[PDB]
């Protein structure tokens, strides 16, 4: 509550209005299980309707909530294999330590990561260390909270160049009904968003972005409407004349079907329009 989100999560709700409920140019297939404790899995299939390629992924996850411990295994179709062990609230409440290891037989590449987070009232801290063979990189982030206000800083240091390759600032304001987010990346990319939960059935979002040195501006508007408890409608536009439409229907308890269409406003009157289909299977 008084505990602020991580840097990456600043502006999440707004991003979510634009991203969720849409799966353009894909046939997506998701099998998920749920347990508060022990085993759960997430299985995913994806066909790209342009490239005809078919991707798959499995993720198994074991939670030992007795000791704030979680074990996760990942497997992709391109034989990428991943292991993730996380410890949360063990040494100190709000402390989180994650060891991650990855391997690709197809490219011989191995990768390992260590992520540490510490959060408490008004503060959310993070330090991620990537032990890439090109050289270690270190990402640090800090989010300060004051009476609904949020200020964040985020950086990335690459030891091989021994140079900062990323320096981002964010400032925002967050209640449960309304969220303001602004950020500037590398003193170069400016972003801003407003999120509003207008009522219990309607959420809206506006997003702005522009780039120093260019007079252009990108914006988008988006909404999500909960028509009943088993149907949800999403619509979005941007100033490149793109229109996104999405409908999500519960066919049966545990089963949701999403249809999505991306229209190019320049030529809605006949043209190439991306469709999407999503099927989520729960438990
Ligand atoms: C943030 C700000 C409103 O916070 P407050 O002054 O009500 O805090 C005082 C808290 N109290 C109302 C409980 C007293 O409003 C803002 O988002 C201002 C919007 C900025 C848009 C810039 C273009
Ligand atoms: C401050 C910020 C604008 O900075 P700039 O991009 O003009 O700097 C570029 C400087 N130059 C114009 C000389 C190139 O504007 C802002 O407060 C934008 C407020 C964000 C709220 C959006 C919802
Ligand atoms: N419709 C949804 N789509 C994606 N994630 C969901 C959805 N509903 C609930 N979740 C939550 O997200 C988790 C799944 O992983 P996921 O990658 O989707 O998280 P995220 O996208 O990073 O952000 P978020 O947790 O808000 O969805 C689940 O544990 C669940 O708590
Ligand atoms: C980031 C947190 C900064 C807190 C500074 C308090 C000043 C607020 N004031 C003067 C407008 O009331
Ligand atoms: C970039 C130019 C300097 C910005 C100074 C901001 C001061 C106010 N505050 C509390 C948000 O830090
Ligand atoms: C480069 C610009 C960094 C600005 C840092 C914030 C300053 C906060 N202040 C001045 C209110 O203490
Ligand atoms: C530079 C932008 C800093 C904005 C801080 N605040 C809340 C005082 O407007
Ligand atoms: C109220 C203060 C206006 C400026 C602050 N902000 C969020 C736009 O950077
Ligand atoms: C444009 C700004 C939309 C504001 C939405 C109402 C939320 C109330 N407030 C001002 C405390 O954030």
UniProtKB/Swiss-Prot annotation:
Superkingdom of this protein's organism: Eukaryota
Keyword Translocase tagged: no
Pfam families (alphabetical): Porin_3
Disulfide bonds, paired cysteine numbers: none
Positions where N6-succinyllysine occurs in the chain: 20
Keyword Ribonucleoprotein: no
Protein name according to UniProt: Non-selective voltage-gated ion channel VDAC1
